[PDB]
């Protein structure tokens, strides 16, 4: 990479970002970080570095730079954008493979990334509730709650299959405690009603059948 006055290098960096090619743009943004680090427009350089990291699948450097920006600038006037960027960086990290196309569902892997994304988008939608990122954020939240509840339903399935009948009660009770309004729990109450019968505790099977029958079909 050659050296110039920095305005022309920022100009060709924006030119490389404009055409959709990213692998060259990250080098020029790093050159802006190196040759003139504390220049008068390093904020747009850092935010475009975040955008290039996200659009070119370089997720750990994206996490490092986004925690660096949340350390250095606590009250930037566009902190909602970098909050939304950390939210998308968490949620796009959840797939990280090619399994969505071949035909296998991914709702059985590590669920900690969706939990971190929920912890981000909660602060986003409850901190800056009149920004230009909220309406997509609530949709990502309502997808992520269902994706999180499918994990607990799909471990209660396995413990029904194994025969650890106290564990399915102690998991479906947690599912009814924490996600009381999703789609997975209304498909998980037959597991609890079948699980209470194999312990001969018939004083609660009528209760679970009442809470199923008072609802609709699905």
């Amino acid at each position: 990479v050659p050296d110039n006055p920095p305005n022309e290098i920022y100009a060709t960096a924006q030119q490389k970002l404009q055409d959709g090619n990213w692998r060259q743009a990250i080098t020029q943004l790093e050159a802006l970080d190196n040759r003139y680090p504390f220049g008068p427009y390093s904020q747009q350089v850092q935010l475009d570095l975040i955008y290039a990291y996200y659009k070119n699948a370089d997720l750990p450097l994206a996490q490092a730079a986004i925690d660096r920006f949340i350390r250095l600038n606590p009250t930037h006037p566009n902190i909602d954008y970098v909050m939304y960027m950390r939210g998308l960086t968490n949620m796009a990290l959840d797939d990280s493979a090619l399994q969505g196309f071949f035909g296998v569902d991914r709702s059985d892997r590590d669920p900690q990334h969706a939990r971190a994304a929920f912890s981000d988008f909660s602060k986003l939608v409850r901190g800056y509730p009149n920004s230009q990122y909220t309406t997509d954020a609530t949709k990502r939240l309502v997808f992520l709650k269902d994706r999180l509840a499918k994990y607990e339903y799909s471990v209660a399935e396995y413990y029904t299959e194994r025969g650890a009948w106290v564990a399915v009660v102690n998991r479906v009770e947690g599912m009814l405690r924490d996600y009381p309004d999703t789609q997975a729990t209304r498909d998980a109450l037959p597991l609890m009603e079948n699980a209470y019968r194999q312990m001969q505790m018939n004083a609660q099977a009528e209760k679970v059948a009442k809470i199923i029958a008072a609802n609709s079909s699905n």
Binding site: G163, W165, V166, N170, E173, M199, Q200, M201, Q204, I211
Partner: protein, 83 residues
Amino acid sequence: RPDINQGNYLTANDVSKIRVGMTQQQVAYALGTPLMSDPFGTNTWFYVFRQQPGHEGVTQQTLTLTFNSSGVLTNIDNKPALS
């Protein structure tokens, strides 16, 4: 080949320790904490001792405690084995 245990633990001596009218947390002092509870509003507790090793069938000592809104014990039920 499997081996599974399920539920709380009893000793067939701790069941001779609780009294009709025992205050709160003293059944938690002797029997230990409950592992599965009834969450739907009625303040009561369960105790299961399920174990089935080595293709021998199941066995169980299902114990049921029903409490008061205050915290004093009200009623017990000690099933020795499943029907």
